[PDB]
A paper describes a structure:
[name] is required for meiotic HR during spermatogenesis, but in somatic cells, it inhibits HR during DNA interstrand crosslink repair by triggering [name] degradation. [name] contains an N-terminal α-helical oligomerisation domain and a C-terminal domain predicted to adopt an Armadillo fold. In somatic animal cells, RAD51 loading onto ssDNA depends on [name], which has multiple RAD51-binding sites and is required for focal accumulation of RAD51 at the sites of damage.
The crystal structure includes four ARM domains and two [name] F15X peptides. The ARM domains A and D, as well as B and C, dimerize through a symmetric interface of about 950 Å2, formed by their N-terminal regions from E122 to I156. This interface is mediated by hydrophobic residues from helices α1, helices α2, and the N-terminus of helices α3. The [name] peptide in orange (chain E) runs along the V-shaped groove formed by chains A and C. Similarly, the other [name] peptide (in red; chain F) runs along the groove formed by chains B and D. At the center of the tetramer, a symmetric interface of about 250 Å2 is observed between the ARM domains A and B, which involves helices α2 and helices α5. In chains E and F, the N-terminal sequence, from N2291 to E2328, interacts with ARM domains C and D, respectively, whereas the C-terminal sequence, from D2312 to T2338, interacts with ARM domains A and B, respectively. [name] motif 1, from N2291 to G2313, and [name] motif 2, from T2314 to R2336, can be nicely superimposed, and interact with the same surface of their respective ARM domains. For example, D2294/2317 contacts R200 (helix α5) through a set of hydrogen bonds/salt bridges; R2295/2318 is hydrogen-bonded to S281 (helix α10); L2304/2327 contacts I242 (helix α7); S2309/C2332 and P2311/2334 interact W132 (helix α1); S2309/C2332 also contacts G188 and is hydrogen-bonded to N192 (helix α4). The main contribution to the nanomolar affinity we measured comes from the large 2740 Å2 interface between one [name] peptide and two [name] ARM domains from two different ARM dimers.
Numbering used by the authors:
A (entry chain B): 121 to 332
B (entry chain C): 121 to 333
C (entry chain A), D (entry chain D): 121 to 331
E (entry chain F): 2291 to 2341
F (entry chain E): 2291 to 2343
Write the structure that this text describes.
Amino acid sequence: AEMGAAACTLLWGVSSSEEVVKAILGGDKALKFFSITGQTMESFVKSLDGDVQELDSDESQFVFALAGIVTNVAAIACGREFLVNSSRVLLDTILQLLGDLKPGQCTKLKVLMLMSLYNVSINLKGLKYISESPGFIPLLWWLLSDPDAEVCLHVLRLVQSVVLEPEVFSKSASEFRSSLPLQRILAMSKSRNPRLQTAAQELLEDLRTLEH
Amino acid sequence: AEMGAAACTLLWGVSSSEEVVKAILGGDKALKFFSITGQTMESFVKSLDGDVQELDSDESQFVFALAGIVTNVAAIACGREFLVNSSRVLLDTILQLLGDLKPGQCTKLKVLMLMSLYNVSINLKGLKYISESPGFIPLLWWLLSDPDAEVCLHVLRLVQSVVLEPEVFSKSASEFRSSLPLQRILAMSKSRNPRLQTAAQELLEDLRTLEHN
Amino acid sequence: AEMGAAACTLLWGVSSSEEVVKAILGGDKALKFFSITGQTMESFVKSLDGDVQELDSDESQFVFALAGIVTNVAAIACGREFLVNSSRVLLDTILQLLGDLKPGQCTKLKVLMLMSLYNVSINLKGLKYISESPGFIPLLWWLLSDPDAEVCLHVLRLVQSVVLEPEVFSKSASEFRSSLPLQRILAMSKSRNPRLQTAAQELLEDLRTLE
Amino acid sequence: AEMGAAACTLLWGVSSSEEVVKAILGGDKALKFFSITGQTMESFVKSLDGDVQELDSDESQFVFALAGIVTNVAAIACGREFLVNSSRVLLDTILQLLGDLKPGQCTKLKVLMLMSLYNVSINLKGLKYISESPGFIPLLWWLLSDPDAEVCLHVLRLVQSVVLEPEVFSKSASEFRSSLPLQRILAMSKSRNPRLQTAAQELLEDLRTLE
Amino acid sequence: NEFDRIIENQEKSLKASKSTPDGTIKDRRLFMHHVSLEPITTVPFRTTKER
Amino acid sequence: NEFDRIIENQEKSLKASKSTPDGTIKDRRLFMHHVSLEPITTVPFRTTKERQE
Ligand SMILES: [Mg+2]
Ligand SMILES: [Mg+2]
C-alpha cells in the first residue's frame, strides 16, 4: 500500500522526460498499466462517498501519481497518440470521474485529470474523442461551478482548446460556443485570482473573435 | 497489488538509463523507496516455506522488479555512491537474504542480488562495506555450493572484485587461504560454459599470483 | 521499390541498437509494421513461381532488410517478448515460408528467417510457440536436406535451442530428441565445413547428454 | 507502397536521436537514401492537382517521413555537415520544391522543409550554399506571402539565421534590402501570437540596424 | 563541434528544431495567429515542505 | 567518477551489470553448465558490388 505509492511517485517524477514516456508506451501491453490505472482511479473515488479530501494518505498519493503519470504521458506527442488509440477506456474513466466528483471533493485529483484531458485534446483524434463524449458540455458547466479557482482555470483551458481548431468549424463548433456558461466566464474574467481572470479573459477574447 | 507491481516493473525498465537513475536519486522520495524495498524483499523471502516460487502473480514479479531496480541503480556511479551512503540497511538486507536463501531456492533473486553487490563493490566505500560485513567469506564459499551455474558465475565475479583490491583483501586474510573452495573453483575452470570457465580461470590466476607475489 | 528497400536497409542498420528496437515496438500500433512485414515476405516468395532468387535486386534486399529487422528486434529481450505476444502471425508466416521455400531457393532469406526463430526461442513462450507449431519436426527434416551449409547450421542451432531447457522433460522432450534425423546430424558432424561440423558435434553432445 | 511509408515513419521516429543519426551516416546505403529522397519528394509535389494540402493514407505520410528525416538529420552537427558535403542535390530539391509549392498547398511539408534549411544553415558551408542558391531572396519573400503563420515563422527564422553572421549578409545586402517587403514584414510585427511576435521583433532589431 | 557557426552573442544562439511523426501528423497545428497551445508536464508534490 | 575503484590494469576492468524485466523474467535461463545461448544481431548485406573502403 505504502510501497505501491512510493513506486508510482518515482515513476511520476521520471515520466517528465520523453525518453521515459516512450519506454512506458509498449509496457502497458504485458502489464495492462493504463487499463488497471483507470480501475484504480475508479476504485479510489468510489471508496470515498463522504469526506472532501483524505490528503497525505498513501491511497490519495497513489492516485495522484497515477493521474500525474497519465498527464506526463499525454504531454508527449506519441503518448497522447497512444492514449486515444489504445487507452480510450482510461479517457472514459477520467471524464466519468470528473462528473462523479462533487464540487470541492478531491480538488488536486480533478486538476491533474483536467490537465491530462487538455494534453490529449492537443491530438486531433483526442479533441474529437473528448468533445464527443457523453454529457461533455453539462460536465464543463458542472466543473465551472467548483469554488476552487485552479479547477475553474483548467476547465477554461480545456474549453479554450475545444473552441480553437476547426471541429469542421461549420455549425458543430458554432453550437458549442452558444452552449457555454458565458455568464460564469464573464464573472471569472473579473476575478480577483489573476491566473483565473486572465484565462477567462483570453477565452472571452477567443469567443468574441469567432462570433458571427 | 497488481497496480503496485506494474509500476515497479515499469520503473525497472526505465532504470536501465543513467538519466533516469540520476532523476530517481534527485527526487526527495528515493530514500523512503530504498528503505521499504529491503523490508519488502525480506518479507517476501521470510514468506517462502521452501517450495520454489511458482512465478507468484505480481508477487515474485514485484520483488524481482525491486532487486532489478536496485541492480540498475548500483550500475550507475552516483547510484552505487547513493546506496553506500544512504541505503546501507538495504545492503545489509541483500547480504542477509543471500545467506537465508537455500541453494536452488529463488535463483533469479540471488543473481539479481549478487549482481547488485558486484556493482556496489565498484564504488570504493561499497567494496569496504560488503567485504567487512559479518559472515561475508563464509557466505561466498557457501553460495559457490549452489548447483546453478549463473549463481556461481556471479559469486566468482564478486570474489574477483574484492580479490582485485589486495588492500581490502588483506584485511580478510587467513580465511581466504583456509576456507576457499579451491576444488570447486578448479572444476569451474573446466566447465563447457566459456563465461563461467574463464571467470574461474581468471580468479585462479589471481588467487595463485597473490599467494606468491 | 528502390526507395522502399533503401529505407528498410537503413532501418536494418540502426535496428542493431536496443534503443532503436524499443522505439520500433510502439510504432507497430499505428502502422502495423510486423503485420505488413509478413505480408511482404509472403508476397515475395509467392512471386518466385517457376524461379529461384535473383539477388543484387531492389526487391531481394527489401525482404532481406525485413527479415534482418525481425531478427534484430527478436535479439532484444523485450523484442522477442513483443513478437510472441503481438506478432504471432508474423512467426506463423516465417515458419510457413521456410516450408514453402524449396531447397536451394532464397538461401539468404532462409538463414535470416532461421536466425529470428532462434532469437524468439530464447523467450520461454517463443520456444513453446515455435516447437508446438504445425509440421515443425517435418520442417526441421526438410530444412536439413538443404545443400547449403549455412542453412543447415542455423537449423542445427535452432534444434539445439529446442533440445536444451525442460520442455516438461517427461517424454515431451524425450520424444522430440528421438524423432530427429540423427543420421544427417551424424553426417554433418564429419562435415568439411568447420562451422557446420562444430554445430552438429555440439548438438550430438547435447543429444547424448540428455539421453 | 504502404510498407515503404511504415519503414520511413519508424526511421523518422528514431532519427530524433543523435546516436541514430551518427549510425545512419555511417552506412553504405546512406548516400543512396538521401539521393532517392529528393527524387521521391520531387515526384510527390509533381502530382498535386490542388485537391487537399496532403491526400493522406501514406504517399503524403511517406514524404512527410522523408522531410522529417532530413530535418532530424540536419538537426545533428555531423548530419548537417554530411548533407552539405554529400547531399547538396537534395538541398537544391528542397529549395526548388519550396518555390514550386503554391501558398496554402502542403503547408506541413513546407514547414518541415524550412526547418531543415534552417538546421543546415547552422553549418558554415550550409549557410553559404543556401544563401548563394538561385532566386533565394525572391523565394524568401514569396514564402512570406503565405497565409499560414507557421510557414511565415520558419521563413523569418531562416532569414534571421542568414542576417546573423554578417559575412554572408554583406554580399546579398543589395538584393535583400532593395526587395524586402515592408507591407508584409512590417505588418507582421503584430503582437497576435508570441513566437511570431518575437520572431519579427528580433529580426527588426538586426535588419533595420545597419550602421 | 567544428564546421558549424558558433555565434559570439550567447543571447541570440542558434537552436535547431526536431520533428516527430505524431507531432507533425497526429497533432493539431496549434501554432496559430491567435496563440500557441502547449502541453502540461506535472511534477510530484513536495508535501510537508522542504527541509 | 570521483569515487569508483579505477583499476591499474586495462584487461582487469570492472564492468557493471544491468537487468531487464523481459530478460530476467520472460527469457529462458540459458546460462547453463553445458553452454550459454545468446542472441544473433545481423548487419546489412554489403551487396555483390563491393568497391573497397
Ligand atoms: Mg457517472
Ligand atoms: Mg503453405
